[PDB]
From a paper:
Flaviviruses enter cells by fusion with endosomal membranes through a rearrangement of the envelope protein E, a class II membrane fusion protein, into fusogenic trimers. The rod‐like E subunits bend into “hairpins” to bring the fusion loops next to the C‐terminal transmembrane (TM) anchors, with the TM‐proximal “stem” element zippering the E trimer to force apposition of the membranes. The E protein is about 500 amino acids (aa) long, with an ectodomain formed by the ~ 400 N‐terminal aa and folded as three β‐sheet rich domains I, II, and III. The ectodomain is followed by a flexible region termed “stem” that tethers it to the C‐terminal transmembrane (TM) helices.
19, which suggested a role for sequence elements in the distal stem in zippering, we designed a recombinant soluble TBEV E protein (sE‐linker) in which an 8‐residue linker (GGGSGGGS) connected Gln404 to Gly427 and the following H3, bypassing most of the proximal stem, i.e., the second half of H1, H2, and the CS. We also introduced the same mutation in the FL (W101H) described in the DENV1 work 19 into the sE‐linker construct (sE‐linker* mutant), to enhance solubility and facilitate trimerization at low pH under crystallization conditions in the absence of detergent. We obtained crystals of the rhombohedral space group H3 diffracting to 2.6 Å resolution. The crystals displayed clear electron density except for the region of the tip of domain II, including the bcd β‐sheet (bearing the FL in the cd loop) and the ij β‐hairpin, which were not resolved. Nevertheless, the density was clear for the stem up to the last residue before the linker (Gln404), which corresponds to Glu403 in DENV1 E —the last residue resolved in that structure 19. As in the DENV1 sE trimer, in the TBEV sE‐linker* structure the stem adopts an extended conformation running within a groove, termed the “αA/B” groove, at the inner surface of domain II of the same chain, formed in between α‐helices A and B and bounded by the 3/10 helical turn η3 (see Appendix Fig S1 for the secondary structure nomenclature). The stem side chains alternate between inter‐ and intra‐chain contacts: those of Ser397, Ile399, Val402, and Gln404 interact with the adjacent subunit, whereas Ser398, Arg401, and Phe403 interact with domain II of the same protomer (the register change from odd to even residues is caused by a bulge of the main chain at Gly400). The domain II region involved in inter‐chain contacts with the stem includes the aa 230–238 region between β‐strand h and helix η3 preceding the ij β‐hairpin, with the Gln404 side chain hydrogen bonding the main chain of the neighboring subunit at residue 233. The only differences are due to a three‐residue insertion in DENV1 E in the βh‐η3 loop, which makes additional contacts and creates a narrower path for the stem.
Numbering used by the authors:
A (entry chain A): 2 to 65, 116 to 146, 157 to 205, 208 to 243, 254 to 404
B (entry chain C): 1 to 69, 89 to 93, 114 to 146, 160 to 203, 210 to 244, 253 to 403
C (entry chain B): 2 to 69, 85 to 93, 115 to 146, 160 to 203, 210 to 404
Write the structure that this text describes.
């Protein structure tokens, strides 16, 4: 599942310093190996924020001149991320055992690790969200056998035509949106209809996970002869679709290919926008798609809106990319 | 050509034959990289855009009404709709969907990057397999931007300005307009077409360059690290241009995207590095010029264009002994509508 | 105070180019030194924006005129003209992330360079070191998109956008002739048939100050709106020079004491100071554990390389996960409770 470090991706100095550049996408692993020392696996294991700030609470079903209240367990709550509080956890392990862990944020970039056999190693990781956090709100329903947490657009959330308040307030704002005597009933159904196909938010306890993002690390090694490899290009005539291009569930395109040639090798990947077959429009999330002796074959990418053609050598598949949207209209 | 040559300081050659090259490519900025016995290659940032950004609020500039009695009420009521082609629509960028297209051509390969897509391998032919790692950087604070477009037709407006626009609004797909009474005064009178009042408020506001579906940005850069193998990289170093031989081709002016642009002519020996700085009137020791142009140079045929950011107030730009006073206006969300 | 550049942090090329990678947090200094040349101190001196854009103005105290309807700037049920009291506004300011300046200073044992998101590269003539290319990637310590500077006529705070936007007070933009939602500071009593009672809710400065308790303060130095969090990551390019390579030994874990026990920095981080009684200079062993696991290090240092120098050192800044944590500085330990995120206290 791990890609090997290539010669081009590291530099060895006259004064014995090795500078390595790793691009680690969520779930992506790179194997770094030095002479006489066991090979180490380096990967981005998680992207999350624990307990993000609660913003507006929307009422889905209004209750009760007497004050308008909300029905029991009938709220839709918003949560906002703090881009500087999101944790990117990098794990280092040989080949559990001598597994090192380092967490980074926008604010915390540098750490010195004692990689045992590789000695004191400097790790400088620049984090990069796969989500435009400024335009995101986590919409969550009250605990009751369905997805009840979504990643919605800020402009959609803020203009939700429902009564609202902040936790601690004892008065609902714009309660006349469900009340007046006129009562409009439970709007959970209308909301769920609008949230169809919208990315679900992975919450594991207090950890609010992100399913997209990477880290670009500058690794500093001292006094060691780094074993560098170079991949040959995979034969374009020996690819098959294990998994044809599909929506990842976080605004990317995922696919998996089968290789029936000599391994390991570099996967030839490109995409063309309809009309121009010369320009490559594939923007890979997978920094180096390869076929390994062990595994390999999974490719993630961004594509322009419209009709595209993905090429994995001579293997092709058309892909229609939908345009951007703040969400479906709610009334 | 405005292509700058790669300098010795901008690359490192390893013991195990690896060359690491750092390029700073601002929109329209080009760098020429050259290897021993191999032809020279031009590397530039060609475009920054997002295709079809998400539609946010639609504002009504001119109310279309029905007969007196999705309604505005006094009791007398009218049905309030919008006039044909009289909307002002908002569009939001997805920072991770903005494409930064890098082109490589001798003296042709294309690679696109986003916040999410940073790495590619490109077969540059005589240079072999080349790893390209580009960190993209918007020249616009995207979180505080809304693209306002009429049915110059488009502008880059501040989010806080857009959100508080005193006009009726709705989202694409909604039947009724919110706050329709903003264009209805009570006998029912219509406040008329507000396009004129809006155009007056949008004066001098940065225009949004829309090329079909491509919503362009005219500000931004990419910082790339280039990995080359088994090749003798040519190392060139620019001498500083003579401070006494500069003259204004185009005196400092607004770029149209919150920067200061200018052009200079050089009468001395070329090519050389342009000496550029600025001082806040009163403080003459501190350099306050923040160049958008990573390496301003005078080329044998070409060079002389300088882009920079400056602090608010009274500044004095220096291109060697050549000087020009520049007044920098402060930040604003926009004019009150 | 200044830490020394380590061997791992720089690479020397075959064609005589040295590439140094510096991480400079606000107030953090790194000493770079070359054989036969004087030492140079490199630090991030300031992070600020001059005159950020003014957004909404909120009224804290209503200036109600004459108690007597189709007019703009009145509250009705009898009608009174509603304006704001003199110097009783709470103004919002938004940063332009691309307009924030990160000033790097270089001095022996003096040159200045300013960077922004948009301006990354500059060439400096470091004198004894010759022409040095400086490429600094700036990084705000504050999520600017979710921040508003709230200032009164302590003067200013960094508040959350969602909190600011939903403030239950009358508002307007500079230049507008009338206040929106002015009825938020007007109260109407039972009518006396010939006259109706009109009350003013009074000055709300007090209620606001109570809600802004513990909220990070905005440091305004004239026109300069400062940030107290953030760093810059610089790629420093040097020519034809023998760069001195130093490597720190690890500090003895048994010789640390608390000069200052873990505390809130005032900008969403944890700060502390330790004293060292062993042989100097050395690298400080710093780690932290959270309730969730005892094996995983959860300390996210703001201080790129905490060291004990001959000339000071011992100050450590870090981010920690929410909840119960235990900070370790060798064998020296201290528990730290980290409060979770919040847009702010409910304002009435």
């Amino acid at each position: 599942r791990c890609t090997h470090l290539e010669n081009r991706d590291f530099v060895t100095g006259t004064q014995g310093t090795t500078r390595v550049t790793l691009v680690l996408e969520l779930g992506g692993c790179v194997t770094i190996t030095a002479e006489g020392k066991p090979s180490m696996d380096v990967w981005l294991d998680a992207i999350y924020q624990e307990n993000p700030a609660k913003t507006r609470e929307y009422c889905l079903h209004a209750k009760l001149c007497v004050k308008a209240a909300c029905e029991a367990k009938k709220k839709a709550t918003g949560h906002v991320y703090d881009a500087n509080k999101i944790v990117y956890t990098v794990k280092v392990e040989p080949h559990h055992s001598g597994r090192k862990t380092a967490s980074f944020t926008i604010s915390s970039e540098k750490t010195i690790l004692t990689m045992g056999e590789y000695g004191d190693v400097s790790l400088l990781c620049r984090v990069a969200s796969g989500v435009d956090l400024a335009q995101t709100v986590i919409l969550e329903l009250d605990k009751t056998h369905l997805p009840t947490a979504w990643q919605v657009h800020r402009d959609w959330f803020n203009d939700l035509a429902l009564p609202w308040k902040h936790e601690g307030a004892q008065n609902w704002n714009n309660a006349e949106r469900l009340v007046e005597v006129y009562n409009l009933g439970d709007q959970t159904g209308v909301l769920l209809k609008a949230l169809a196909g919208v990315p679900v938010a992975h919450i594991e306890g207090t950890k609010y996970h992100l399913k997209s993002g990477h880290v670009t690390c500058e690794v500093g090694l001292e006094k060691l002869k780094m074993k560098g490899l170079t991949y040959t290009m995979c034969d374009k005539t020996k690819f098959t679709w294990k998994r044809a291009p599909t929506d990842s569930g976080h605004d990317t395109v995922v696919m998996e290919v089968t290789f029936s040639g000599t391994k390991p090798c570099r996967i030839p990947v490109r995409a063309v926008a309809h009309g121009s077959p010369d320009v490559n429009v594939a923007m890979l999330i997978t920094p180096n798609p390869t076929i390994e002796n062990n595994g390999g074959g999974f490719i993630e990418m961004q594509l322009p809106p419209g009709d595209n053609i993905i090429y994995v050598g001579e293997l092709s598949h058309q892909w229609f990319q939908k345009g951007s949207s703040i969400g479906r209209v709610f009334q």
